[PDB]
Amino acid sequence: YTRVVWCAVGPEEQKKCQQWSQQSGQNVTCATASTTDDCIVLVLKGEADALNLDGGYIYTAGKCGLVPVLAENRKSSKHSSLDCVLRPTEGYLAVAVVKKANEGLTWNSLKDKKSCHTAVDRTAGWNIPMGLIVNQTGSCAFDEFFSQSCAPGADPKSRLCALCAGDDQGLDKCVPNSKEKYYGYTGAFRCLAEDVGDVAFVKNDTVWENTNGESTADWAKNLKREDFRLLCLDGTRKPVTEAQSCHLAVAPNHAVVSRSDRAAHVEQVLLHQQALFGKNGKNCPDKFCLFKSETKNLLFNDNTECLAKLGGRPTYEEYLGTEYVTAIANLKKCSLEACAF
């Protein structure tokens, strides 16, 4: 009676989830929805139990009363004896990436350029960079700052969707799931790499995992790191090896959320599922790896080492930290105490 219904966002997640479901002997089964917001609503209703969320999505979910359960944890430096599940999480570095060739474009000349964003309301792709730009300009006209963008989840006929490409057929332009060619970390970095946009708002790790052979994927196999630079907030440009000193912010790790009344069942099952299909897991790479999806980042980021227990049974505000929570409150002025649903 601890069976968990995962929420898959879009059909490729759904496909991975079904393979997970089948491989788990139905300890995990799958609900599917078209956007993250719809998946949150399913969980609210009790029609799904859980999914992994970006930080901006944890905020929306948390005002609706959902709670973080386990955090994604990637490759670590200090405290590396301590086992992944126990090891605290550090956050990731939100960066703004450009082409080297595009000379002279800096954090200080982004007005009227072309922008690539993971999705609207995501941490590295939107909350951080738009939060900065509104604050930098005293202006809530964030939809008027770039000339065109791919910002999945924005109005498809607005300039915020003009660069979005939609699916293999050109359908679903600007939908916030992986059918949108330029959706997500890997999508927004693609948007930049094919020179559709002038800047992509992603995290530090995306640049590395999609260059210098780390990706075999079609558009990525020939990408070279030296061809990109990070935009720092002092107006300078740096190599993508300097993310530590040229980032826009540090982001709270993506975390599994659930209904509070289900949080404990979800926690146990996921710990158990990870021992079966995570990094060194009994059945990965043999039958199934929870943490791989050929760089599509389906249901978990592909760089995820393990899902880690959280210290202090945190609220969602505590999980996100009080800096990030205000920044998001401030930004949402352009648009306090209400669940959105």
Ligand X SMILES: *[C@@H]1O[C@H](CO)[C@@H](O)[C@H](O)[C@H]1NC(C)=O
Ligand Y SMILES: C[C@@H](C(=O)O)c1cccc(Oc2ccccc2)c1
Ligand Z SMILES: *[C@@H]1O[C@H](CO)[C@@H](O[C@@H]2O[C@H](CO)[C@@H](O)[C@H](O)[C@H]2NC(C)=O)[C@H](O)[C@H]1NC(C)=O
Closest CA to 31 of 5, 70, 58: 5
Verify binding: residue 327, ligand X, rule CB under 6 A: yes
What tokens appear for 80 in the block?
A: 């590396």
135 binds ligand X (CB under 6 A): yes
Q: How many residues bind Zn ion (CB under 5 A)?
A: 1
Pick one of 89, 123, 204, 253: the residue that binds Fe ion (CB under 5 A).
123
Considering only residues 257 to 286 of the shown chain, the ones binding ligand X according to CB under 6 A are: 272
Are the C-beta atoms of residues 70 and 307 closer than 8 Å to each other? yes
185: annotated binding-site residue? yes
Cβ density class 34-59: b for 16+ within 10 Å, e for less: ebbbbbbbbbbeeebbbbbbbbbbbb
Q: Of the listed pieces 17-25, 115-123, 153-161, 208-216, which binds Fe ion according to CB under 5 A?
A: 115-123
59 appears as a binding residue in the annotation: no
Q: C-beta of 120: minimal distance to ligand Y in Å?
A: 5
Q: Which DSSP state fits 252? A: P
Give the shortest CB-45-to-ligand Z separation in angstroms: 37
Smallest separation (angstroms) from ligand X to the CB of 201: 12
What DSSP line would sit under 53-95, residue for residue?
E-HHHHHHHHHTTEEEEEEEE---STTTTS-TTTSPP--EEEE
Token pair of 301, please?
Answer: 């980021």
Residue 272, annotated ligand binder? no
Name which position in 22, 27, 76, 147 contacts ligand X (CB under 6 A). Answer: 27
Question: In this structure, are strands 28-33 and 4-9 parallel, antiparallel, or unpaired?
Answer: parallel
Q: Which residues bind ligand Z (CB under 6 A)?
A: 75, 77, 93, 204-205, 208-209, 214, 243-244
Give the residue ranges of the annotated binding site for hydrogencarbonate: 118, 122, 124-125
- State the residues that interact with Zn ion by CB under 5 A: 318
